[PDB]
Paper text:
A crystal structure of the MDM2161-191pS166/pS186 peptide in complex with a 14-3-3σ ΔC construct (lacking the final 17 residues at the C-terminus) was determined to a resolution of 1.3 Å. The complex of the 14-3-3σ dimer shows density for a single peptide occupying both 14-3-3σ binding grooves. In the crystal, the asymmetric complex sits at the same site (around a crystal twofold axis) in two different orientations, so that the ordered parts of the N-terminal (residues 164AIpSE167) and C-terminal (184HKpSD187) portions of the peptide overlap (static disorder). The peptide binds in the expected orientation with its C-terminal end directed toward the N terminus of 14-3-3σ. Both pS166 and pS186 phosphorylation sites are engaged with the 14-3-3σ binding groove, interacting with the residues that form the phosphate-binding pocket: R56, R129, and Y130. [name] peptide main chain atoms interact with the side chains of 14-3-3σ N175 and N226 and, together with the pS side chain interactions, define the pose of the peptide backbone around the phosphorylation site in a [name] sequence-independent manner. In the 164AIpSE167 part of the peptide, a hydrophobic contact is observed between the side chains of [name] I165 and 14-3-3σ L229 while [name] E167 forms a salt bridge with 14-3-3σ K122. H-bonds are observed between the side chains of [name] H184 and 14-3-3σ Y181, E182, and W230 and between the side chains of [name] K185 and 14-3-3σ D225; [name] D187 forms a salt bridge with 14-3-3σ K122. The interactions of the 184HKpSD187 part of the peptide confirm the ones already observed in PDB ID 6YR617 and more broadly both peptides bind in a similar way to other 14-3-3 client peptides. However, the data indicates that the peptide does not bridge the 14-3-3σ dimer with both phosphosites simultaneously bound to each monomeric unit.
Mouse Double Minute 2 ([name]) is a key negative regulator of the tumor suppressor protein p53. The 14-3-3 family of adaptor proteins are known to bind [name] and the 14-3-3σ isoform controls [name] cellular localization and stability to inhibit its activity. Here, we provide a detailed biophysical and structural characterization of the phosphorylation-dependent interaction between 14-3-3σ and peptides that mimic the 14-3-3 binding motifs within [name]. The data show that di-phosphorylation of [name] at S166 and S186 is essential for high affinity 14-3-3 binding and that the binary complex formed involves one [name] di-phosphorylated peptide bound to a dimer of 14-3-3σ.
Author numbering:
A (entry chain B), B (entry chain B): 164 to 167, 184 to 187
C (entry chain A), D (entry chain A): -3 to 231
The structure:
Amino acid sequence: AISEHKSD
Amino acid sequence: AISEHKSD
Amino acid sequence: AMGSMERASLIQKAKLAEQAERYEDMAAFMKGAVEKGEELSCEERNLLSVAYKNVVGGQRAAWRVLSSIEQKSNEEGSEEKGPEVREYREKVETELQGVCDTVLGLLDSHLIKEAGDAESRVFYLKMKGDYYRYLAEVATGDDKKRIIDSARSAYQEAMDISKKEMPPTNPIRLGLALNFSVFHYEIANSPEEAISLAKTTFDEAMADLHTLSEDSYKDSTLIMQLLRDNLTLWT
Amino acid sequence: AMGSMERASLIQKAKLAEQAERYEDMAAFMKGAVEKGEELSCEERNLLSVAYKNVVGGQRAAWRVLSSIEQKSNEEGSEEKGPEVREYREKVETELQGVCDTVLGLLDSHLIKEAGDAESRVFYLKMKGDYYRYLAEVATGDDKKRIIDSARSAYQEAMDISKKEMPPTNPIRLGLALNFSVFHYEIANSPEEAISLAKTTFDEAMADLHTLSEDSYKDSTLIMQLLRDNLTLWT
Ligand SMILES: [Cl-]
Ligand SMILES: [Cl-]
Ligand SMILES: [Mg+2]
Ligand SMILES: [Mg+2]
Ligand SMILES: [Mg+2]
Ligand SMILES: [Mg+2]
């Protein structure tokens, strides 16, 4: 998953 | 230049 | 920290450290700036976040490499070779926990309590959720559940304020929802909640894009694409 | 350093740190291993070199970014903004000099004096040349000339041994010649000497490739390509 996976 | 530019 | 340096000089040096990719220095400069005791502007909040995200990001990547080696060493047929893998993973883990505890300490003393506007309060509560989430990624003992709940509680309070006070395309609101969806998927074992949150957030933002200028549209759609990327991985 | 850790555990943890991209830790583990006082094997010499090259490489890249910002601030028409750029460049510079001094200290106490075989002695004298070269890159005072001469003297002694004791395709011999040619070009203001050295080294290696196995041919030609890359930039 990306946080800002994708992450923020 | 590369050392090992390119360098080593 | 850096008590003899002027606040403005610490901010200026954090920006230089960012350009030099010296993120440990950048974080130390920003920690010193926070400890001056004045609230942070939007740009200064971003510098604080960038600095610690990069420091903890390196630690997390190293921890994942070491944890994978350690798990392989505990499989059937693996040769012993001793305590070193576990010891070194523990060293990196302790350092990562220390960085998380330092960021949480800054939020608790006293960034959050002094943040009255929605933009600043949501930013800091999102950060609190994020750093408890990084603690959760490496937690295995009797406080894992309490760490997970602390991350959930911070993200939930941030989400409640963001939904009341910010438009659905606000980049902080979007980044919060993205990270809370990752929390659901990876930490809370709630993939359906993660998917539902990402989908609702994406759709509500799409419906509001018509209100935005070209630059705000670019800002919002960049984060929306990250929600879509996760949805494509999860569905 | 790391005096309570076994030598074998320090080597094992240096390899784990390399896999985790934790180069500061890798260097500290290898410094502890050297300080046990036993000679280093070829693999262990490579770990020492990889660890410190990556640490100093980050510092050099940061220093170059900061020096460029500082030089722009000293141009006509540039606004003042204060001592911060210089102070922070000086901080990074001092840290870089400290890493160089630490590596030079390990070579002097006592890696070089205990290295009797050509492979180990040339490796360490090349390292001595390299870290004096990194000191030279940031030197501006009354010892710049002596630092440049120390780098030259170490590379020259390494070259004299390598030419007597190693074939012209030996990867250490090749990497030494490559780095001494970069010293000539960038530090000593001797671009013709740099070009001549790179060309002679490349041609003498090419003439000896017929003696090599497929794997040794790959090792040597990879370094030969770096000599060619510099020659294309310089001519
Ligand atoms: Cl350790
Ligand atoms: Cl400084
Ligand atoms: Mg003041
Ligand atoms: Mg306030
Ligand atoms: Mg022992
Ligand atoms: Mg010996």
